[PDB]
């Protein structure tokens, strides 16, 4: 349950997270577009559900994309600006799951996404430490999906 | 057609934006919650567009309504990092209105939140100068809409 799944969010999980954040939250609209073009290029067949995207391949000239790109940092900083308090990070994980069931993504659909944030980190120099801090908060995600 | 409202967003109505913004946005929570009850309580009919969050009149102890109004915030988060760049703003305020436009919500409609936008400013002193301010951003959605 989505409950059980923030409680493993520890107190060195939350730190890891804050401090690579801290890097890779700096720009959002940089690092989010290098996210989902690694996401689209590892795993082809997950473009079918960004078709209104349109030309994926573009990257940062997709207007699009970009947008998109951009909104979804911004829910990864609310994630982390929740960290503080499992009540509030739940009903904002909940919410946010909403629109993803709705397209019926799953819960290991959504779990792709962990190879793309592992790949990014790696550019940033934060490796396996730190990649499986952000899977810890994705599990979160996927328990509510 | 959102790049000619983003016009009006001068350099004096976003210097009140960013001012305002470091006040509300520093309890996104609280202030976000404000909103939308300010929003039911003004205008009871938009309460039909939310029948999923349930019990409204809970308020911040309605974990649904409270996860809604935090993620707004980020939303709003989000446009007032953009605004030096209209290019990053128009992209997202589309992406941000791809979902109100599903959901059937006019700019008429859209526009009944500057009444709680000018309350939530005032419980906080920010007065006419600021309320217009926000009033603009305001207006950039809805020619999105
Ligand atoms: C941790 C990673 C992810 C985050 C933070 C995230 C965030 C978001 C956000 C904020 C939105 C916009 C609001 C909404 O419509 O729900 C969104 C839209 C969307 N997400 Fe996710 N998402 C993530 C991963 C994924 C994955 C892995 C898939 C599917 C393979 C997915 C599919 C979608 C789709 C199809 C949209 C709509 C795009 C559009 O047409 O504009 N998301 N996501
Ligand atoms: C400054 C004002 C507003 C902001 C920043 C805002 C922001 C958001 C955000 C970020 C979401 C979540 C992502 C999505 O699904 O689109 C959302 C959802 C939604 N918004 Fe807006 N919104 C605003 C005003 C309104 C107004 C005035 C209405 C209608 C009277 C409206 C109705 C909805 C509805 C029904 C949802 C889904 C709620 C749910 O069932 O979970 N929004 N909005």
């Given at each position: 349950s989505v409950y059980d799944a923030?409680?493993?969010?520890?107190?060195?999980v939350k730190k890891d997270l804050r401090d690579s954040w801290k890097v890779?939250?700096?720009?959002?609209?940089?690092?989010?577009?290098?996210?989902?073009?690694?996401?689209?290029?590892?795993?082809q067949e997950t473009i079918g559900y960004f078709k209104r995207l349109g030309d994926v391949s573009?990257?940062?000239?997709?207007?699009?994309?970009?947008?998109?790109?951009?909104?979804?940092?911004?829910?990864?900083?609310?994630?982390?600006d929740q960290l503080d308090n499992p009540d509030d990070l739940v009903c904002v994980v909940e919410k946010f799951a909403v629109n993803h069931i709705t397209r019926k993504i799953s819960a290991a659909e959504f779990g792709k996404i962990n190879g793309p944030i592992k790949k990014v980190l790696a550019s940033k120099n934060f490796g396996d430490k730190y990649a499986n801090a952000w899977a810890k908060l994705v599990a979160v995600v996927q328990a509510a999906l």
């Open positions: 923030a409680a493993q969010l520890t107190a060195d890779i939250g700096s720009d959002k609209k940089g690092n989010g577009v290098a996210l989902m073009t690694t996401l689209f290029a590892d795993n573009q990257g940062m000239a997709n207007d699009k994309l970009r947008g998109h790109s951009i909104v979804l940092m911004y829910a990864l900083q609310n994630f982390i």
